[PDB]
Amino acid sequence: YFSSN
Amino acid sequence: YFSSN
């Protein structure tokens, strides 16, 4: 689960 | 607001 804006 | 169990 990666970083998202 | 104090500590309560």
Place this chain on the structure above:
Amino acid sequence: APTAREENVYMAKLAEQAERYEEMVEFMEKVSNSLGSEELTVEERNLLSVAYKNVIGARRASWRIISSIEQKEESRGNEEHVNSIREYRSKIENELSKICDGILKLLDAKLIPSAASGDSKVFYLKMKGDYHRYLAEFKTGAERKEAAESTLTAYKAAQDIATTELAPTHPIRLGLALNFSVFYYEILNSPDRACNLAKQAFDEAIAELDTLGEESYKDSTLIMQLLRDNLTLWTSDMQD
């Protein structure tokens, strides 16, 4: 095939992991309304109380935030915001009153008439004290008196059993003292009997630890820190 009771308990633990405590409450209530003469296991009884403490706890936190804001906008004489804030608060209070009445009906209808040991009698009476005390925290006038009166009857019934049936070091008894003292301090505005009660629970626990040890040390030492915390900041305020 597992029973409905087993699968409700399993769902409740799934609800706790997903942090969906409303449904955790619903599953644990199905378990409670399926009881006959027997009582909840320590595990199910703690799952019910964790469910409700987290449902009510989110509204309490919301109430506290909206109260502080309203006290500020009152301080500026900004009435239009004040009236909006109070419709919002009144809505949060309507949820608090519903959550409390859910567990309080369960406790009198199923849980307390099933309690068969000291452990669970104290546990349920103290939880009855707790939720009448959450009502007291926001009610005014006549409503506040009735809450506070209910709270005090429940905690004193709990404590008559706790002091005669459980050890001073028992976390449910220490937790009771912790909350009972908080009720004196914050609801009855009586710092004298808050400290006498808190400090007496602490001192009987210390005395038992010093002479007999205790089992389930993990939980009790932390409640004991809580007692000592409230004490040292209550007594700094009486001096300061």
Place this chain on the structure above:
Amino acid sequence: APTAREENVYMAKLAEQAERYEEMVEFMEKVSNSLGSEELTVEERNLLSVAYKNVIGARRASWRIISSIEQKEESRGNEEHVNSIREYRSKIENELSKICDGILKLLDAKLIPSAASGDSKVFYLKMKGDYHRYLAEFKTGAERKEAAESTLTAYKAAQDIATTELAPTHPIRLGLALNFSVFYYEILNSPDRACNLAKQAFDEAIAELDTLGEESYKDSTLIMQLLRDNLTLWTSDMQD
């Protein structure tokens, strides 16, 4: 006397402070459905997106937790728990599908036909990309393809406008690149075009900062850290 629009906006900010984002969503939707030819202010437009990101965000976190649990109980061949877990998951997914369809109808019906500047066109198209991509994250089969297809159309429409109308350093454009690349990596399982996109957004931003500076530096440098974070751990996985 203040208008309903003013009081809905004020309630939404009360809802955000009390952390009751469902009602924050409802208040901000009343503001959006009260629009004529004009569009939302930057503030109201960010209140709407914060409301929805927190409603959906709690279900996503719940889904992730219940998915990992189910993948473990599958690993033991424990089918009865697996079937309970999946009824729970299916319920969380029914909420995800409803939350997404709420904002996605609003975006096509009111928000995108009102957008009048590059800033808001990109903002709403990227938010349309975002919520089709949250559907993709849990759908399977035919349903997954349709989501992924919708996601890609929206992000590419957003980016055709972003690259021609906004500066490389604009946080809405950097945020778009950030999410578009995530969509390639996690939905399309294409690490090649994730890195090409992420690293190109980063490099055009660095180039503008080095020559022209930028205004609203606060927000952009952090999204830029996000881009660089995803890059360095994507590229360690291709090597490792």
